[PDB]
Write a protein that binds this ligand. Sequence first.
Ligand SMILES: Nc1ncnc2c1ncn2[C@@H]1O[C@H](COP(=O)(O)OP(=O)(O)O)[C@@H](O)[C@H]1O
Ligand SMILES: Nc1ncnc2c1ncn2[C@@H]1O[C@H](COP(=O)(O)O)[C@@H](O)[C@H]1O
Ligand SMILES: [Zn+2]
Length: 215
Amino acid sequence: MNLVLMGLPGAGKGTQAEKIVEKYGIPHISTGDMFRAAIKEGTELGLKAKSFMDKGELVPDEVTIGIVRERLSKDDCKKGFLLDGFPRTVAQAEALDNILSELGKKLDYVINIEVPKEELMERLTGRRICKTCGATYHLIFNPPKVEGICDKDGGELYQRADDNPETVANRLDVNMKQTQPLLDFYEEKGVLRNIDGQQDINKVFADIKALLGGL
Ligand SMILES: Nc1ncnc2c1ncn2[C@@H]1O[C@H](COP(=O)(O)OP(=O)(O)O)[C@@H](O)[C@H]1O
Ligand SMILES: Nc1ncnc2c1ncn2[C@@H]1O[C@H](COP(=O)(O)O)[C@@H](O)[C@H]1O
Ligand SMILES: [Zn+2]
């Protein structure tokens, strides 16, 4: 089961990714998670990635492709994987095509979770994520069992530096700019499925399960 989740910041990819991996047991590969881990570790790569991430800009394709290639070479990806938030440029989708040629694999689906722009600000400003595993919550729409504490592992919940209204507006511009070229790319391959992300979390998941049951 070889999957991409795509969608604008705040659309629900992490949320759904968590549910997909619990149900099916494939690895969650999130480029955002990896970069935040790198910045927390203080790696050379993390410190270089921080400047883009703090501005809501994309990390260069070379760096991003490098981290994803390495992740995809691990044994846990041999029975499938979930890419969450990669690719985000047509160059990255082209790279992924080649990578997957080398791995003798193809994407089963690119799941595009569509949410109107106007709703994304509220999703992002109420978002809180776990320090220790990156689980995603929302203070209104999806709160933790206990305020400020992750359901899974008890980690502290925090507001991402980039989930402030100024940085969010730049993020939405930057990612929208890449969206139609990516939709067109995967529409041409015939693997793009659009999901209505303006539904109940569990309804959105129901729709994804309908796609995935076959693989
Ligand atoms: N279908 C939904 N309805 C309402 N809120 C949602 C839904 N899906 C996710 N959320 C919440 O909105 C925010 C963005 O979701 P998230 O999965 O982190 O987005 P992404 O990974 O696409 O940026 C989070 O605070 C999350 O709890
Ligand atoms: N595929 C990617 N390409 C370039 N930058 C990325 C990618 N995925 C994540 N990032 C960087 O990580 C930040 C957080 O991503 P996310 O966690 O998906 O919101 C983005 O604003 C980018 O700076
Ligand atoms: Zn956690």
